[PDB]
Amino acid sequence: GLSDGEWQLVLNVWGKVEADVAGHGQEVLIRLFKGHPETLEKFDKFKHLKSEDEMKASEDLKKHGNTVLTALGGILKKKGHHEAELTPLAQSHATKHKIPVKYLEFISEAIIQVLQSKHPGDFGADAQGAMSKALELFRNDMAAKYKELGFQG
């Protein structure tokens, strides 16, 4: 539900993420886990990470962060017409990983926080608003797919 101008601002700051996907992904997950400690309970692989230093050293955390942002990038680049990319994610997140829409809100927050911390100059008022909207569109379409699949939106 974004304008063309809004999608442009989204893809322009996403260009910064594409210059270092894994570093941004790492920071996103660390911000998610430190901010909302309960999210860490969905990851049986990361149950032994007892501090930010342990999270920073984990090669599997950094690879997962890379996987997450690569996928989200794929979705953002479709500017709304992302059904084919969104479906498999909604399927796996509603069924196997058991990820509530609320945790999608927490990771959306962490994405924004990381963009703001790393690119303060490039992530101004207009780019922040546009990115909020894009993440909201993503959460809303994930939620609608979850409901169609028989789960809580």
Ligand code: HEM
């Ligand atoms: C921007 C939002 C997110 C995106 C784009 C995303 C993307 C992905 C992708 C691409 C995978 C691997 C393929 C698959 O299984 O579907 C994955 C796996 C996973 N995701 Fe998500 N994810 C997101 C948010 C979350 C959140 C918020 C959580 C938990 C709080 C989560 C938990 C997991 C888990 C537990 C796995 C499997 C990990 C493993 O192999 O041990 N994801 N995610």
